[PDB]
Amino acid sequence: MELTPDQQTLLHFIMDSYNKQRMPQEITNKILKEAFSAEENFLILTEMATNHVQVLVEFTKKLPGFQTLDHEDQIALLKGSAVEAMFLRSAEIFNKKLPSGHSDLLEARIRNSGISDEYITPMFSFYKSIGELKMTQEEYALLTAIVILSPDRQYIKDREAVEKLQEPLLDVLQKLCKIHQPENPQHFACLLGRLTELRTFNHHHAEMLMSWRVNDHKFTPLLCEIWDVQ
């Protein structure tokens, strides 16, 4: 039931590695301070997303055993998880407690950022569904590691090697769910179920960005590799 010493070591190591990201306050303070045009928000998005890719590669490299995987499989895992990890991190920031009325303004500002209405409803439905799970910091860090170490990604040659790296993270998350929320025995299953909803953001990620209400969609060379954009 309780975490073993090795699992406690793994958990604190994943947490330390995950904490190298930008502070949620830095991100939300900028959006809440003043309203920006769709052009200004697109530029904020590309800068934020390019920095997230860099942080994600650094976190991924720290995952136990990731460096021992086949080099082509490493690329496939990174490319297959980058968009999902960016949305899961946006969902985490969206659901951080802010003073009265601030989350309403944050939501209204994102709704009016330049993104098309067809993508707003599935995006907020996911952020709100994530928020109802009342996830802790450790749960977001482990879920992000689980999303990266998905053995079912397209182009993965050695799935078993990936399964072996993912299995101890799933074991730790399941124990945490049983500890954090003993009143809700479905908590682990609902966290894993949300991972299925997260995968839907892959199919339309390129269309979401290209349909942003701006004249020119200029991306960075690193985003062009990770996203399916020119």
Next chain:
Amino acid sequence: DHQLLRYLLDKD
């Protein structure tokens, strides 16, 4: 090609 990703993965 994913040359920037490959570079970020293979550095250090």
